[PDB]
Amino acid sequence: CEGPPPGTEQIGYRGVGMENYYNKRQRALSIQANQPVESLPAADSTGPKASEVYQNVQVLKDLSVGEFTRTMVAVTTWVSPKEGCNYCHVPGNWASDDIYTKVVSRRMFELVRAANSDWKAHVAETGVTCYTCHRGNPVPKYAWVTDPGPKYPSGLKPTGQNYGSKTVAYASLPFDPLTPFLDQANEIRITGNAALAGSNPASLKQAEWTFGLMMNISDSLGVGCTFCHNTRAFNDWTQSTPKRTTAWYAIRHVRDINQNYIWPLNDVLPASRKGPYGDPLRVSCMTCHQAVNKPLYGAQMAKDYPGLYKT
Amino acid sequence: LTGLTDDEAKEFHAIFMQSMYAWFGLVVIAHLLAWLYRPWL
Amino acid sequence: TGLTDDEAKEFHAIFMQSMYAWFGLVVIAHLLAWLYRPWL
Amino acid sequence: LTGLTDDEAKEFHAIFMQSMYAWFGLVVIAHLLAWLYRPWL
Amino acid sequence: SLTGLTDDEAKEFHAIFMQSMYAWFGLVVIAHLLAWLYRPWL
Amino acid sequence: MNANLYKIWLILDPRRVLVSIVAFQIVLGLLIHMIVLSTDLNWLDDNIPVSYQALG
Amino acid sequence: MNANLYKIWLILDPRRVLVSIVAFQIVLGLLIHMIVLSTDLNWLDDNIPVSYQALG
Amino acid sequence: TMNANLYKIWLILDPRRVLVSIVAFQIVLGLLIHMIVLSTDLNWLDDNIPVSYQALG
Amino acid sequence: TMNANLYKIWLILDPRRVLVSIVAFQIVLGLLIHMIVLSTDLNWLDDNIPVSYQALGK
Amino acid sequence: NANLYKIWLILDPRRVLVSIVAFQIVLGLLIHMIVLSTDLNWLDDNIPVSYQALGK
Amino acid sequence: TMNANLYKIWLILDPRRVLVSIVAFQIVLGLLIHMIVLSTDLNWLDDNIPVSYQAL
Amino acid sequence: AAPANAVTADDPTAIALKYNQDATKSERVAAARPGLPPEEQHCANCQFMQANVGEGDWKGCQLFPGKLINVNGWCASWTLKAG
Ligand code: BCL
Ligand code: BCL
Ligand code: BCL
Ligand code: BCL
Ligand code: BCL
Ligand code: HEM
Ligand code: HEM
Ligand code: HEM
Ligand code: HEM
Ligand code: SF4
Ligand SMILES: [Ca+2]
Ligand SMILES: [Ca+2]
Ligand SMILES: [Ca+2]
Ligand SMILES: [Ca+2]
Ligand SMILES: [Ca+2]
Ligand SMILES: [Ca+2]
């Protein structure tokens, strides 16, 4: 039970019913829980580039030594503040890559730089830092693995649904839409483009998988369907909000992160980072958004770190 | 009008007021303890 | 209600002793709980 | 009021309490075994 | 007698009830002896 | 108060007033506890004096 | 006030008026508290004198 | 401080129904309070104190 | 330590209504306990002991 | 109390027995189900051994 | 150990209702047990023993 | 007598790195940082100290941009000054 009045926002034209409601007190506590860590003081951007001072810099080549050191301090607070520099570094040998966390972190740098430079259709000018996902934890709190669901006897094939699962916001819809849609790239559209039957082979069961994914997307951003759709015509882009366009690119962004950045790290990640199917903990909308329509309520962290952008 | 004689209403009132005051007393003790432990204003 | 005045005296006597007895157990249980896992 | 005479209420109470103590006695023993096997506090 | 049994009838039924209950409990104990030997759970 | 306040029981039924008080008080007490637990004053999940699940 | 104002109870039922006032006041009291709790005057979630969830 | 004639409460309220209401209310309350406590940090069953018994396997 | 007059329980409770209830409860409890055990590591049907009979055919 | 036996002059002995029996069975089922939902679970704890492992 | 007066149970429980309930319980229990076993590794219908009969 | 931009004990980076401005009140022994015996590791001989920032015992550090450390301090990121 909650108490009135809720916070409200009008999304669509008056009377169409596209409106958002939220709890004011939960918003205030969420805002408290999504504070951005204050950016480090600016460093001197002069002197030799990191490419010519250090021994094994493969990504951050063009940073000055000051900007490079500043970046290492920042990522330590964002990822491994309790452990410190040596979470990713062999003691007494900064150049060595002979610890799995450094190999992973190097690709994470490329992940973030690709996000900040190439996916502005999604992350705009706000961008992402290590903090967006890690939040001061080496292992992101909201990573996911393929969910096997409840146990069945050996003579009954699991249905993948009809179970109370948080992943689809506690509906009984197919409870793992992440693997088929945010890892693999199965088709999400099911609505026909013609009034009369004859040219739409999509199925009712595909509708349920898509519906399950949309619960997860909505739940991951803390919004209702009307944040992106006019639900009298879910398929109709002309009646949707610009957030739907953003969400479209974000789905493809998430696919790129898991297939090209996370999955190739599976063999070097320890078994503790893997699910029952051997797959690595990886990325969904929840991993960055964490139940907010914008990660950290849109806090601009990446802009204060030039090393978080490509070339 | 309620069935109660004027003396019964006198006796019920005496017992009602003494009991309500004692309950209010328990309420005050509990709110003092709560204020000592967790002042809310 | 039907009870006579003496029947009210008798029931009230047993009720109050019983309730105080129940309340005494509640106090002991809360003492055990405070000693084991203080909550304030 | 229930139909039992005073002596009947006395006889029923003696057996009821004796039986309930036997049941409560068994409960303590089971709890003792449970605590020896898997202490929970 | 609220059920309608006489005092001797209530005594005869009790005797047969307790014996049958114990025989059932005997079976339950024998079954659990086999299960502990086959598949101890504690 | 007034010397003749007792006459209130010539107008209002004593029994119905009592039961209504008992019903109102139990409901209000359940309601107020729920209201307080939903605020910053929550005394159960404040990890005071300690968090007992971090002890495990 | 008029001297013969007491004649109001010759035309209005004393028991219903007493009950009507009691019901109105309890409802109004709950309504005003919920209203005040929905404004800047809210004294429960104002972290005053202190935030108790912040103590750990 | 109680009153001397408080016993007359049973001339107004049925003692049997009060008893059954008290017994019913107290059982409900005890079930409710335990489940409330089990839903907070104070939970004494899943706290792995003194030990986690699932970790033994 | 039972009471000598415990047989008098059948002066208060109907023996017939009691017997049917015990049978129904015991049947249901038996069904219930079997299912709980099957849901755990103790499962004696899907444990492939002595052998797995589906492997024999696939 | 010495006169506690009179409780059977007030409350029907036959329904109280049935209510006690009914309440105790449900409570016993409830408490087992609660304990089996926690770390104290003794059935799926692989103690003394995991029997599903024995079959792999 | 059985009692010599066990036949007197038919003075207590109606023979007709007992017989009907037994065959109803046994039929339902037998359906249930066959269901459980089919849903496990013990399945004797889909085990392809002695052969698989689904030809290409 | 510390300057205004000195690294202070409440600085988050100082906490994560276990910095102290007096290396004898530091956790240099526990970390056993390689390159020298932990009883000789302080700021003056660390690769990350910028001799061209600050003045006196209060020099610059790379890890603490815009701030100054003390040459007699230590933190858990200690690395021999090879250059
Ligand atoms: C900082 C917050 C404080 C706190 C602040 C306060 C304050 C302040 C007060 C209370 C009060 C109470 N609190 Mg609190 N409370 C805290 C934590 C707790 C916890 C807990 C799990 O942590 C519990 C269980 C309680 C419990 C209690 C009660 C003992 C009491 C309210 C009784 C009531 O509503 O009376 C209802 C009133 C009656 C008169 C009931 C009469 C009984 C009748 C005879 C019942 C018969 C049964 C009935 C007829 C059944 C209906 C019939 C159905 C058909 C079955 N507190 C914390 C520590 N609490 C109040 C109190 O102590 O009052 C003295 C109070 O003023
Ligand atoms: C870890 C301990 C848990 C908790 C676990 C349980 C569980 C579990 C149950 C109860 C039950 C009850 N608890 Mg408790 N209870 C807690 C805290 C409280 C507080 C409080 C001020 O914090 C209060 C007033 C209560 C009150 C109550 C009653 C409503 C109820 C007993 C029946 C009854 O009606 O008696 C009212 C008659 C009285 C005389 C009031 C009793 C007052 C008790 C002794 C508490 C006040 C003192 C309290 C311990 C103060 C702290 C100590 C000092 C700091 C040293 N609980 C904390 C959060 N409580 C039981 C129940 O429902 O029984 C039916 C039950 O099963
Ligand atoms: C931190 C949490 C604490 C804890 C804190 C408390 C506190 C605090 C209280 C209880 C109380 C009770 N708890 Mg608890 N409880 C814990 C864990 C458990 C577990 C469990 C599976 O872990 C169980 C099954 C119980 C069970 C019980 C009951 C025996 C009792 C509630 C009776 C009631 O509602 O009467 C309502 C019924 C009536 C009023 C009817 C009339 C009287 C009846 C006939 C009384 C019969 C005797 C009674 C059951 C005897 C037991 C008292 C013992 C001292 C425990 N506790 C843990 C260890 N528990 C309460 C208690 O002891 O009350 C005295 C109480 O105040
Ligand atoms: C790993 C766990 C074990 C196991 C552990 C146990 C244990 C432990 C017990 C049982 C008991 C029973 N098990 Mg089992 N059980 C296993 C596998 C099975 C399988 C199966 C398909 O695999 C089946 C169908 C059964 C079936 C049964 C019933 C015959 C019996 C409970 C009946 C009841 O509730 O009566 C309730 C009905 C009444 C009380 C009414 C009165 C009884 C009437 C007069 C008699 C009916 C026939 C009687 C039950 C015969 C029992 C004979 C043998 C001891 C089996 N078991 C596995 C291998 N099973 C119980 C038992 O033997 O009880 C004695 C018991 O305690
Ligand atoms: C730590 C976890 C422990 C454990 C801890 C406890 C504890 C602690 C207790 C129980 C109790 C019970 N447990 Mg357990 N229990 C465990 C595992 C099991 C398993 C299982 C499949 O693993 C089962 C089926 C049971 C079953 C039961 C019942 C025998 C009993 C509840 C009866 C009841 O509610 O009566 C309610 C019905 C009535 C009161 C009706 C009136 C009397 C009736 C007609 C006669 C009943 C006979 C009675 C059951 C005889 C048995 C006593 C023995 C000492 C066990 N336990 C594990 C190993 N269990 C309780 C108990 O022993 O009670 C004495 C109890 O307090
Ligand atoms: C802690 C604040 C910290 C310091 C100091 C630090 C230093 C450091 C250096 C000097 C290098 C370059 C070494 C060389 O000569 O090649 C370097 C490189 C990387 N580091 Fe780092 N580092 C610190 C902390 C961390 C932490 C906590 C991580 C992991 C999250 C991390 C990761 C990396 C990565 C990756 C590189 C390689 C970068 C590249 O461009 O290839 N560092 N670090
Ligand atoms: C930012 C540049 C950044 C760094 C640095 C970083 C580091 C890092 C490490 C060291 C790991 C391995 C942790 C471990 O011990 O297993 C790791 C793993 C994951 N990360 Fe990461 N990470 C950075 C950025 C980001 C961002 C922006 C996201 C979210 C999109 C993200 C997510 C993940 C995931 C998923 C993992 C795998 C699970 C795991 O091994 O812990 N990272 N990261
Ligand atoms: C709310 C829970 C919700 C529902 C329901 C919903 C439905 C839905 C459907 C049926 C489709 C398929 C449309 C078609 O067949 O062409 C669909 C597609 C997209 N949605 Fe959606 N949707 C809901 C919520 C949200 C929210 C909150 C967003 C925006 C963040 C969003 C976005 C999208 C996007 C993008 C698509 C197109 C995906 C693709 O074609 O690859 N949805 N939705
Ligand atoms: C998951 C597939 C996913 C969806 C869906 C999604 C949607 C989304 C929207 C609609 C916005 C715009 C919100 C608005 O109010 O305009 C948005 C914004 C950001 N996102 Fe996102 N997003 C998904 C996943 C992820 C992941 C995994 C990350 C982190 C790597 C991420 C990041 C961001 C950031 C940053 C923004 C803010 C951009 C801005 O306009 O300010 N998203 N996302
Ligand atoms: S990095 Fe080196 S010079 Fe800088 S504060 Fe730490 S120990 Fe001193
Ligand atoms: Ca507390
Ligand atoms: Ca306040
Ligand atoms: Ca515990
Ligand atoms: Ca087997
Ligand atoms: Ca076990
Ligand atoms: Ca076969």
From TrEMBL, chains B, D:
Q: Which residues form the Antenna complex alpha/beta subunit domain?
A: 7-41
- Quote the InterPro entries the UniProt record gives: Antenna_a/b, Antenna_beta_dom_sf, LHB-1/5, Light-harvesting_complex
Fetch the Pfam families from UniProt.
LHC
The residues that the entry says bind Ca(2+) 1 are 40
| Localization annotation | Cell inner membrane
Keyword field: Antenna complex, Bacteriochlorophyll, Calcium, Cell membrane, Chlorophyll, Chromophore, Light-harvesting polypeptide, Magnesium, Membrane, Metal-binding, Transmembrane, Transmembrane helix
**What molecular functions are annotated in GO for this chain?**
bacteriochlorophyll binding; metal ion binding
Q: Where does a bacteriochlorophyll bind?
A: 13, 31
Q: Where does bacteriochlorophyll a 1 bind?
A: 23, 31, 40
* Residues holding bacteriochlorophyll a 2: 31
Annotated Ca(2+) 2 binding lies at: 41
This protein's GO cellular component annotations are:
plasma membrane; plasma membrane light-harvesting complex
The entry's bacteriochlorophyll a 3-binding residues are: 31, 40
Q: Which residues cross the membrane?
A: 14-37
Which Gene3D superfamilies does the annotation name?
1.20.5.250
Give the family, as the similarity comment puts it.
Answer: Belongs to the antenna complex beta subunit family.
Q: What is this protein called?
A: LH1 beta polypeptide
Q: Which organism is it from?
A: Thermochromatium tepidum
Q: Give the gene symbol.
A: pufB
TrEMBL record, chain K:
Name the major location.
Answer: membrane
Q: Where is the Antenna complex alpha/beta subunit domain?
A: 7-45
Q: Which domain of life is it from?
A: Bacteria
Residue ranges of the TM segments: 18-37
Per UniProt, bacteriochlorophyll a 6 binds at 34, 44
A Gene Ontology biological process in which this protein takes part is: photosynthesis, light reaction
Q: GO terms for CC? A: organelle inner membrane; plasma membrane; plasma membrane light-harvesting complex
Which keywords appear in this protein's UniProt record, sorted alphabetically?
Antenna complex, Bacteriochlorophyll, Calcium, Cell membrane, Chlorophyll, Chromophore, Light-harvesting polypeptide, Magnesium, Membrane, Metal-binding, Transmembrane, Transmembrane helix
Which residues bind Ca(2+) per the record? 44, 47-49
- Subcellular localization(s) per the UniProt record: Cell membrane
Report the membrane topology from the UniProt record.
Single-pass type II membrane protein
Looking up InterPro entries in the UniProt record yields: Antenna_a/b (IPR000066), Antenna_alpha (IPR018332), Antenna_alpha_CS (IPR002361), Light-harvesting_complex (IPR035889)
Sequence positions that bind bacteriochlorophyll a 3: 26, 34
GO MF terms here are: bacteriochlorophyll binding; metal ion binding
> For bacteriochlorophyll a 2, which residues are the binding ones?
26
User: Residues that bind bacteriochlorophyll a 1, according to the entry?
Assistant: 34, 44
Summary of the function given for this chain in its UniProt record: Antenna complexes are light-harvesting systems, which transfer the excitation energy to the reaction centers.
The protein, known as: LH1 alpha polypeptide
Gene name for this UniProt entry:
pufA
